[PDB]
Design a protein around this nucleic acid. Sequence first.
RNA 1: UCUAAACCAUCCUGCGGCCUCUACUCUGCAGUUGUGGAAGGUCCAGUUUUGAGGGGCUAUUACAAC
RNA 2: AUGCAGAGUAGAGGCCGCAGGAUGUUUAGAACA
Length: 1002
Amino acid sequence: EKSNKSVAMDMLNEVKRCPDELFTTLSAEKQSRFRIISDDHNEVLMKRSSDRFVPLLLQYIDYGKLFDHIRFHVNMGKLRYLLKADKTCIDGQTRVRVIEQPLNGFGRLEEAETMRKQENGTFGNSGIRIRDFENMKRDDANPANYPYIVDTYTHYILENNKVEMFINDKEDSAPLLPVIEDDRYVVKTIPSCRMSTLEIPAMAFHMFLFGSKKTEKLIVDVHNRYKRLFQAMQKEEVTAENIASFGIAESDLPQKILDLISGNAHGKDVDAFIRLTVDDMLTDTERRIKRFKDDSTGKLADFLAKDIVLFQPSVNDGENKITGLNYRIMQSAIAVYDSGDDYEAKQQFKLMFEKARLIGKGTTEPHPFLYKVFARSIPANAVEFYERYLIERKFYLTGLSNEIKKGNRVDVPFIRRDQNKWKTPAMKTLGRIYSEDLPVELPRQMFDNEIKSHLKSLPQMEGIDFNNANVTYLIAEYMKRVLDDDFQTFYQWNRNYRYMDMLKGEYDRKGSLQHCFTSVEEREGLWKERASRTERYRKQASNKIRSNRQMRNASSEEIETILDKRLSNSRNEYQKSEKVIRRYRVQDALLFLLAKKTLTELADFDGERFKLKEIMPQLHLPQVLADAVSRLVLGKFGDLTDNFSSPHARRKVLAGVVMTTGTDVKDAKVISVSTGTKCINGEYMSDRGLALNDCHAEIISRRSLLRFLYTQLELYLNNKDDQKRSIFQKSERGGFRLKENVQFHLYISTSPCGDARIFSPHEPILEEPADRHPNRKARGQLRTKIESGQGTIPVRSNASIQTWDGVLQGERLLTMSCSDKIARWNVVGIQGSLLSIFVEPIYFSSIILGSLYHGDHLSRAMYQRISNIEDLPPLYTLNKPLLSGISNAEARQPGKAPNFSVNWTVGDSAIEVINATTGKDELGRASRLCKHALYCRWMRVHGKVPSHLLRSKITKPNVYHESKLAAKEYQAAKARLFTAFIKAGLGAWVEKPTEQDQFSLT
RNA sequence: UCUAAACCAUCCUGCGGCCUCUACUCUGCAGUUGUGGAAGGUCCAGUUUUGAGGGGCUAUUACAAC
RNA sequence: AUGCAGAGUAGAGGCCGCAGGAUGUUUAGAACA
Ligand SMILES: O=P(O)(O)O[C@H]1[C@H](OP(=O)(O)O)[C@@H](OP(=O)(O)O)[C@H](OP(=O)(O)O)[C@@H](OP(=O)(O)O)[C@H]1OP(=O)(O)O
Ligand SMILES: [Zn+2]
């Protein structure tokens, strides 16, 4: 419920808040001063969400009953009627068609509101039901539910910075509500006259000085002068001789009246306009063609729908052109169009434009060039359609330009020669339009002369030049000189503007332009000096762009244009903002004055003292198995090195493989043990397969496990009694398979280099969450050890393939990281290609780290990154082994990393010591683990296996690479793996030069 | 066996400048035709702290018709 | 309502530039089996 008192209090609570335009310019400290704590201990931003000056003033006049005759334009809801429940649209789909009309009228907000909603819930004297606000079925298709009126509280219509009003002849007139006819037409009333919202401060000021009745008489008198003028025009009784008699200043007459009496009445030149429009549009078309080739279908469809309708010829008062619903459908249809080169879908898309009568035979108003878009072929999607549309537009406009250049007359659909725009205006015709068809446009400065005459009589105003004094100025002088008041303190606070930053030309040490907060006095002075200061600004700013590495310095236009737009936009933003804030000041003065007047005359209140200046705002237990394998590997190593005393007992990384045959830890056997941290030097690659390429422990321990597997196949093939002791058995699928209970577990002293280690090279502080950046592209990426360099490096940075001659000259040899190699084992198996011709894929059940264990990283590295692996050949799978750290992590081994690498397989009398730099032992002899040795074992086993018992029966020559290729399924699993990594965007595997595996056994 | 210096080019943590996606909130705009530039919005340069003028360009407010 | 544009806030990335740590080689010295 509003009242005189409530409006007064709404005004005072308006002026304590910061205007939004001001708030933007203030320092954080001063912005903080509007953030208030309420009574109920709640923080409130005391900032204006909109300029409510004008509605507040209208409420003041209405509730005050201050105008006897003038009533403001109110809206009281919308009428909705159902035109058709089943309307076939241009896409041939049926939709409801609802039409809305606003219920606009004139009266005091309270009186109009009392009329709007009857007790029976109907609108005014219409009979038509007002639908409850909670009911929101806008798509409702039931004719019985229509017509209805949307429930909306009476508000003033305040659009386009205008206030529209109706002048009643008699006082105490009732609200003027629109009549509804045929449950369909809302019969509305042209306003008497329309006032700029920028005129409302002067009206308020006039009201405050003279009284609302004197204010009202003036508006009505001005209105009646315009009406008398427009009546005389219709009688052709307006001349240069008598124009002054109408009582309206030249600057408040339309130019056409001034042209007409001066004998200079003219239309615009349509041909010039056509020539200009065609050229402008051709240029724009080429701009759009270029931008698109250089570079949202929604954005495309917006352009296309507007343009298609622009080029649609109008006939019959425009009744033929595309209507609202069909427009929305056309635009949306385009936005989502994407056939798939489906013929029917293409036909359907073309048909839409046929039904809109834009293309096709028998069309009378076709689009001039759209049909060319569909000549030869229908475009497949919105993007193809936009391109073809623009090309065809270019050809059409070029044709027109060429005809214009020949001096010929051309016509475009959207320029219409019959519009008055192009004809000479007539007095009598124009008289009628001004009198009958439109509201009177009230002039600016209508209250100025009266305001100034009053103020001239006040002795406090004696020393002001009223010949250079606008009403904004005079309100402020009134507050200061008659009332000893001033604006709110926050209009003196320093403000920030980009434009003023540029003009001040102040940079911080990094080189960025500083945000200054200036006073109004400072800005006055910067503005005076803007020419010089703009020169300086541009010089520096151009260098900043020119210093940037991108090369656009040869072109002259590029930079100057960028800066032109920068300075224009900034300058315009600053000027408008400053002008508007100056309006907020005097608006606030007026609200304060009016509110204070209301409250003074209400109750025991002595408010003369108050001033605006004062206003302010599970088979095993994980850890048991982990610690078992850890102690057993470490222990077997301690045995082989004479209690870690032996010459080669020094190690940095240690690894090993443990076999389990059952849950009994008295059934755990150490299969192999190894140490090493280096890879071969490039000069020492062996084309006979006699060197070890990678001596990182875990890699060596797998190779030792291969030896053990060979030994077991031989044990089985030796004799029947031995078959019982061998871990292998025949498979019904052909070849050999492990016994049901048999499992292998890998143990490494430390995380495998690469994805499991690079990000987390330190021991986790326990209970720590995963890495804070798990989505970086670095994560999961394949990595290589790089020859003669530290760290493990993405494969993407070395895309080329490795060549033998290349490495030899000094290209650095790349070896896949241990993380990548073990993930590979978790797909293709640990046995490798050659054993896969005899045995079924074998996987590690567990990977156990003695230090540097990060499950988040280890799991990603070991399998998670390639969970998108598909089409694995039979018996292959993405193995997910038990991952675990140990109970008591190992200490950093002290000293420098030995250049040697130690191996041992179960059954061996001694360890073997290899120089990782050379791939060979101290005396330069080949390893029992080298390619050649393993090929030798493989050849002997091959000779002993009856050909019916082979998993792969492919026969190839006895070259290592060929023999590996015999393992067709394994190679296919390897291809699945590589594709998994690539498709996950983790880079392509790097292999050795193809010469590496091209040797025979002598 | 221990220590010092240098290189390789990635990774982590923090701080700047620039560009994108995801989620949430708010505002603006969204058929054609006719009339109308006194008004509202926009731009130009010896323009204003004074919603005041000047010169170029513009149908947004409203009305009826479909 | 739905779609298109603009602004704000938080998160996650990409590029450019700084500071401090982490991670296979090269050049020396001391000392030892
Ligand atoms: O990881 P490593 O133990 O060092 O050995 C492997 C193994 O080669 P060898 O068993 O012949 O030593 C791979 O062969 P498979 O057993 O999986 O069949 C081979 O891959 P290819 O099959 O493609 O030859 C790969 O070499 P690369 O991947 O570099 O081509 C090579 O690793 P290294 O090259 O690092 O020794
Ligand atoms: Zn490694």
